[PDB]
Amino acid sequence: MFMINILMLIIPILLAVAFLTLVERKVLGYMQLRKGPNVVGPYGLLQPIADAIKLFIKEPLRPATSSASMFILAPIMALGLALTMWIPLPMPYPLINMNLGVLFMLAMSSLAVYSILWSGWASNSKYALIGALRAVAQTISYEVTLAIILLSVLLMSGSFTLSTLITTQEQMWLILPAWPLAMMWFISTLAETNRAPFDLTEGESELGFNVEYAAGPFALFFMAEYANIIMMNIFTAILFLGTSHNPHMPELYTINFTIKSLLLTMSFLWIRASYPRFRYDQLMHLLWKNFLPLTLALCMWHVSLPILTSGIPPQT
């Protein structure tokens, strides 16, 4: 039955990513005083399916890559890791109930930089490499704050278990005691996934690294990128917007937890439509000069606050 469980997790993820493209195009449209896809199927419900077929029957380029083996390794790694980051998520019961699940997601997330770096090499273009280096430097810089912020929150939880975050928020959301950390966690997730106002890769007039890809290989990078947008917003809701779990009616948890995860995913689309784009030197200064000093200071505060109130959580 476990094999059925894996497929009941993978296929719905891909379908959710497929229809996120539609929802993104329509929310952006109405914030721009237009409609978005409403011709391909009722209210554009067949638009995602048309786009998929079109890309997979379009001839791919595959230029004279310096390797031709990194060019095929990069999208496998991106999509393979993107699906792997879902297996420990409690919704409310994990597919894999890890003891160190929060640490597992950091570990797998830090490996996604290779697909950005490898695709830079494979393109064989000197300029495409520069774009890959800027993207890589952005991702590693902003996962410094992901690790420290996560550590600060877990000091009020007591473990790296993801399902213990549900117990921790059984009386109150962690957004209340730790809203300053939530702000810098939310922005740090935009920078990680190269989202506006942090999308210099897709931000033409300055550069992207996945420029030589077309057809199916391009869609694989796209699917992995959007599955990470949903996953990080599911992580945020679990971390800062805990949903009460009733063991007799687990579906009640899933409905409430999904609504929160959608509202946070739509917030990503909302923020894209509202602001201009950061300069490369300016998003680096937002991390090394503004977030990091506060994150380090709040880490000191959250190591000491539980001790001086007698509120250290249980180890188990």
């Binding site: 003891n99 160190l100 640490l103 830090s110 930089v113 090499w121």
Partner: protein
């Protein structure tokens, strides 16, 4: 064949080492060292070390090895010896595997056994905690001296590297 998972991983561990030890282009050499690192974590996980195994992914693979690949793509300007060394490495691995799987005893400097790694595992545990985790958390209660010297060295690493790279 699932009882010898640790030995199978170790065999893949060695083959990766023969990969980048033969020194192909740095791009492929770093690729082979990532495979060995992942296999290396797999071995540590099956011995009960979960925090240590995951620390390999986060700090070694997702850390140092990213800096290695990052520096290679920017300062490396993207033969018979490589193939000769690579083939020589695999043959020695095959013979070492062949003999330890035939008579289950090999003597090369040390006396190695071939029964199986599972035979040395401890047979009793009923704790309400992770023994590995307790030891690592002791870094702050017992390892006061370790924390000071390690922290100072990391601080000096920042100072030293900026001095070296200024160039004037």
């Amino acid at each position: 064949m699932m009882l010898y998972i640790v030995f199978i991983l170790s065999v893949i561990f060695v083959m990766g080492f023969v990969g980048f030890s033969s020194k192909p282009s740095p791009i492929y050499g770093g690729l082979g060292l990532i495979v060995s690192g992942g296999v290396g974590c797999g071995i540590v996980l099956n011995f009960g070390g979960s925090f240590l195994g995951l620390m390999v992914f986060l700090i070694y693979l997702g850390g140092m090895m990213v800096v290695f690949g990052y520096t290679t793509a920017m300062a490396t300007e993207q033969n018979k010896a490589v193939l000769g060394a690579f083939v020589t490495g695999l043959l020695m691995e095959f013979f070492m595997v062949y003999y330890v799987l035939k008579d289950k005893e090999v003597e090369v400097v040390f006396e190695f056994n071939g029964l199986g790694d599972w035979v040395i595992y401890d047979t009793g545990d009923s704790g309400f905690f992770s023994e590995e985790a307790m030891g690592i958390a002791a870094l702050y209660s017992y390892g006061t001296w370790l924390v000071i010297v390690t922290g100072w060295s990391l601080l000096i690493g920042v100072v030293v590297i900026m001095e070296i790279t200024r160039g004037n």
